[PDB]
Amino acid sequence: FKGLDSKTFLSEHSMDMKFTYCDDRITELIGYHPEELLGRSAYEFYHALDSENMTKSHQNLCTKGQVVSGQYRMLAKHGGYVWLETQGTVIYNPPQCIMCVNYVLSEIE
Amino acid sequence: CQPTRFISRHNIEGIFTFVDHRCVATVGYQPQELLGKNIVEFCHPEDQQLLRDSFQQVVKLKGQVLSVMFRFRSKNQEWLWMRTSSFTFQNPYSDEIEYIICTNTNVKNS
């Protein structure tokens, strides 16, 4: 059993969802090192069956400014998928980037 | 040209509880020089009350973004304009106290 903080990790993205920053917490959870994620679109990691829903979720975030993803699966470094939910928020200026708070809902399956 | 920014997490009092190492390039401090101090300790005296009042209100805003601009003392003791965009997060499976997530950008006052 893990405490709430240990199953949450923050990420930052450009508007096309490429990773620009990721908290090191992701490594214990999903296996990736933050530095290997930079420049990869998050969409590379979404299960096929969640892809159409995440595309709609992204459009909602871009239109509204904030979104909650609902449950989806993210591919782990050493195969397997975890269930996650993400709250996304667009940071706008005087859109600049997307801030994601990601919470793991499962073990690697 | 990529704006220079770093992320931090704060308790609702303003104390840094998580600092992204991008802070060294943005303001010149190591994360450990910020962790455990109040962001208000690095704020120009004319802006301190604004920044206090912003932390106080972001928790009333149902998780929406609140922005504030203020002068941040860099490691070189110089005043840099920062635009901090903040919002609260609370994991909905819990009743743990919300905390505040900030993105801190060096910006022009022009």
UniProtKB/Swiss-Prot annotation, chain A:
It comes from Homo sapiens. The hydroxylated prolines promote interaction with VHL, initiating rapid ubiquitination and subsequent proteasomal degradation. Under hypoxia, proline hydroxylation is impaired and ubiquitination is attenuated, resulting in stabilization. This is Endothelial PAS domain-containing protein 1. It is linked to Erythrocytosis, familial, 4: An autosomal dominant disorder characterized by elevated serum hemoglobin and hematocrit, and normal platelet and leukocyte counts. Residues 69-108 form the PAC domain. Residues 4-65 form the PAS domain. It is found in: Nucleus; Nucleus speckle. Expressed in most tissues, with highest levels in placenta, lung and heart. Selectively expressed in endothelial cells. Interacts with HIF3A. Efficient DNA binding requires dimerization with another bHLH protein. Heterodimerizes with ARNT; heterodimer binds to core DNA sequence 5'-TACGTG-3' within the hypoxia response element (HRE) of target gene promoters. Interacts with CREBBP. Interacts with EGLN1. Interacts with VHL. (Microbial infection) Interacts with Kaposi's sarcoma-associated herpesvirus/HHV-8 protein ORF34; this interaction results in increased stability of EPAS1 and thus activation of its transcriptional activity. Transcription factor involved in the induction of oxygen regulated genes. Heterodimerizes with ARNT; heterodimer binds to core DNA sequence 5'-TACGTG-3' within the hypoxia response element (HRE) of target gene promoters. Regulates the vascular endothelial growth factor (VEGF) expression and seems to be implicated in the development of blood vessels and the tubular system of lung. May also play a role in the formation of the endothelium that gives rise to the blood brain barrier. Potent activator of the Tie-2 tyrosine kinase expression.
From Swiss-Prot, chain B:
Monomer. Homodimer only upon binding to a DNA. Efficient DNA binding requires dimerization with another bHLH protein. Interacts with TACC3. Interacts with HIF1A, EPAS1, NPAS1 and NPAS3; forms a heterodimer that binds core DNA sequence 5'-TACGTG-3' within the hypoxia response element (HRE) of target gene promoters. Forms a heterodimer with AHRR, as well as with other bHLH proteins. Interacts with NOCA7. Interacts with TACC3. The gene is ARNT. This is Aryl hydrocarbon receptor nuclear translocator. Required for activity of the AHR. Upon ligand binding, AHR translocates into the nucleus, where it heterodimerizes with ARNT and induces transcription by binding to xenobiotic response elements (XRE). Not required for the ligand-binding subunit to translocate from the cytosol to the nucleus after ligand binding. The complex initiates transcription of genes involved in the regulation of a variety of biological processes, including angiogenesis, hematopoiesis, drug and lipid metabolism, cell motility and immune modulation. Residues 1-62 form the PAS domain. The chain holds residues 358 to 467 of 789 of the full protein. Residues 67-110 form the PAC domain. It is found in: Nucleus.
